[PDB]
């Protein structure tokens, strides 16, 4: 039975509004309703992995697991295995996988982050799950960010705290946050970004939604505008939104948006908004294709509609050779020519590089680079031809060309990372000098970039 080179992943996000679900929720797992929906011809085909994020979830873990498993069994006639479940307050993540994947899944991690301080600590934050699927690392984050149209900057802060402090994936990757630890990272939830239009336009917005004319609403969506201005979710992707705003509905119908200020809303307006979202970030040149992104029409117990997204994702096998793992394969090497880092820092410490990859026995520290003054004020750290030669555990190009090198540039004075990035070994040629490039981030903010040339030697 051969190992897969692709899997499908279902991502769900639903703010349940503290109400139990209706008896049937299969439309969610089938990607049926509005938006980019799944073909009917696929309905009996199980996804490999289902990741369910809920917010304002009133159910016990046991109660929700029974509903989810019984739902999937009705659709697929498959009894899914529970990979992980983690709950912070009323924010929950469940990962389910086909039984054939049980002995492909390992290194399961869960964590949570509580956002805010005092007043604003006690119900918002994030839960997450990571694991290895054969040779591929997968991370999943369900966040419930700060509410309210006027609090976009609080949401951006919540985002930075979650990606700094959520402790998932390989702890040996110590310079790297969750935005660099995984081959594929999915981040979803009630992100709570709103359509930033005047209150007086509520009925006009509703009109536009009834016409299925979303363009003038999406151009004011705070998440799209904050992402375009590089304020949040830098280097994440989102599929085009082609479904109606998923908040705020009158319960037990979808015919009415309930936007007016009420004591129950703290006298705040809730103009129709795309609160409920799915984004992802995959390592460079790894296959990832969104095959659905939409909302259900028939699940009406909450003031939010459920959102679904599905993906084709590239995966690799757990490779063994005569040599690695447990030794190097002298027929493999990775060389770096004409390399330099450009950093936004006002500091003047010496800097060195760390190279981290599961194709290495352990991470590799470089010598210090040579600082020059850049012509526009920036710091340029020159490595030239001085970077060490990396010795992969396996030389077979079927393995090595699928790998990635994580780079941290660190202060010699403090050993703190000033920037993190990632280089793909999926090159156009071997034994050939080729340009490489990554942006550098720290705490998920842009801090610089790393560029130079690579020369990769494989067994072929
Ligand atoms: O339970 C797991 C991890 C796992 C892996 C795959 C899946 Cl589909 C579900 C769970 N390991 C384990 N095994 C025996 C005793 C204790 N822990």
UniProtKB/Swiss-Prot annotation:
Tissue: Specifically expressed in immune and hematopoietic cells. Expressed in bone marrow and blood cells. Levels vary considerably within this compartment. Present in at least 74% of immature CD34+ cells, whereas within the more mature population of CD33+ cells, it is present in only 10% of cells. Present in the majority of T-cells, while it is present in a minority of B-cells (at protein level).
Subcellular location field: Cytoplasm; Cell membrane; Membrane raft; Cytoplasm, Cytoskeleton
Post-translational note: Tyrosine phosphorylated by the members of the SRC family after exposure to a diverse array of extracellular stimuli such as cytokines, growth factors, antibodies, chemokines, integrin ligands and hypertonic and oxidative stress. Phosphorylated upon IgG receptor FCGR2B-binding.
Secretion signal span: none
Highest rank taxon of the organism: Eukaryota
UniProt record similarity statement: Belongs to the inositol 1,4,5-trisphosphate 5-phosphatase family.
Quaternary structure annotation from Swiss-Prot or TrEMBL: Interacts with tyrosine phosphorylated form of SHC1. Interacts with tyrosine phosphorylated form of DOK1. Interacts with tyrosine phosphorylated form of DOK3. Interacts with tyrosine phosphorylated form of SLAMF1/CD150. Interacts with PTPN11 in response to IL-3. Interacts with receptor EPOR. Interacts with receptors MS4A2/FCER1B and FCER1G. Interacts with receptors FCGR2B and FCGR3. Interacts with receptor FCGR2A, leading to regulate gene expression during the phagocytic process. Interacts with GRB2. Interacts with PLCG1. Interacts with tyrosine kinases SRC and TEC. Interacts with c-Met/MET.
Name this protein carries in UniProt: Phosphatidylinositol 3,4,5-trisphosphate 5-phosphatase 1
Species this protein is from: Homo sapiens
Shown stretch of the complete protein: 398 to 857 of 1189
């Amino acid at each position: 039975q051969p190992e897969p080179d692709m899997i499908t992943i279902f991502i769900g996000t639903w703010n349940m509004g503290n109400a139990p679900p209706p008896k049937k929720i299969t439309s969610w797992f089938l990607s049926k309703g509005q938006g980019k929906t799944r073909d009917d011809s696929a309905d009996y085909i199980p996804h490999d992995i289902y990741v369910i994020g809920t917010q304002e979830d009133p159910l016990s873990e046991k109660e929700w697991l029974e509903i989810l498993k019984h739902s999937l069994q009705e659709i697929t006639s498959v009894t899914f295995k529970t990979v992980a479940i983690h709950t912070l307050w009323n924010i929950r993540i469940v990962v389910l996988a086909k039984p054939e994947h049980e002995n492909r899944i390992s290194h399961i991690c869960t964590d949570n982050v509580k956002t805010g301080i005092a007043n604003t600590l006690g119900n918002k934050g994030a839960v997450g799950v990571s694991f290895m699927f054969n040779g591929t690392s997968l991370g999943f984050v369900n966040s419930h960010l700060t509410s309210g149209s006027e609090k976009k900057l609080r949401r951006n802060q919540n985002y930075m705290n979650i990606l700094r402090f959520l402790a998932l994936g390989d702890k040996k990757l110590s310079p790297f946050n969750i935005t660099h630890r995984f081959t594929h990272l999915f981040w979803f939830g009630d992100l709570n970004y709103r359509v930033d239009l005047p209150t007086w336009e509520a009925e006009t917005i509703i009109q536009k939604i009834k016409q299925q004319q979303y363009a003038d609403l999406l151009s004011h969506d705070q998440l799209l505008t904050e992402r375009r201005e590089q304020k949040v979710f830098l280097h994440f992707e989102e599929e085009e939104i082609t479904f109606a705003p998923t908040y705020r509905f009158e319960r037990l119908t979808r015919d009415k948006y309930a936007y007016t200020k009420q004591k129950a809303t703290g006298m705040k307006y809730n103009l129709p908004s795309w609160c409920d979202r799915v984004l992802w970030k995959s390592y460079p040149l790894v296959h990832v294709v969104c095959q659905s992104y939409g909302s259900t029409s028939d699940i009406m117990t909450s003031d939010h509609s459920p959102v679904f997204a599905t993906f084709e994702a590239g995966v690799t096998s757990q490779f063994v050779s005569k040599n690695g793992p447990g030794t190097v394969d002298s027929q493999g090497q990775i060389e770096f020519l004409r390399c330099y880092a450009t950093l936004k820092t006002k500091s003047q410490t010496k800097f060195y590089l760390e190279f981290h990859s599961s194709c290495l026995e352990s991470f590799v520290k470089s010598q210090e680079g040579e600082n020059e003054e850049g012509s526009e004020g920036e710091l340029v750290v020159k490595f030239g031809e001085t970077l060490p030669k990396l010795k992969p555990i396996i030389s077979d190009p079927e393995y090595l060309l699928d790998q990635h090198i994580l780079i941290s540039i660190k202060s010699s004075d403090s050993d703190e990372s000033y920037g993190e990035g990632c280089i793909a070994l999926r090159l156009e040629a071997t034994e050939t000098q080729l340009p490489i490039y990554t942006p550098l981030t720290h705490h998920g903010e842009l801090t610089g970039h790393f560029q130079g040339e690579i020369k990769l030697q494989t067994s072929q």
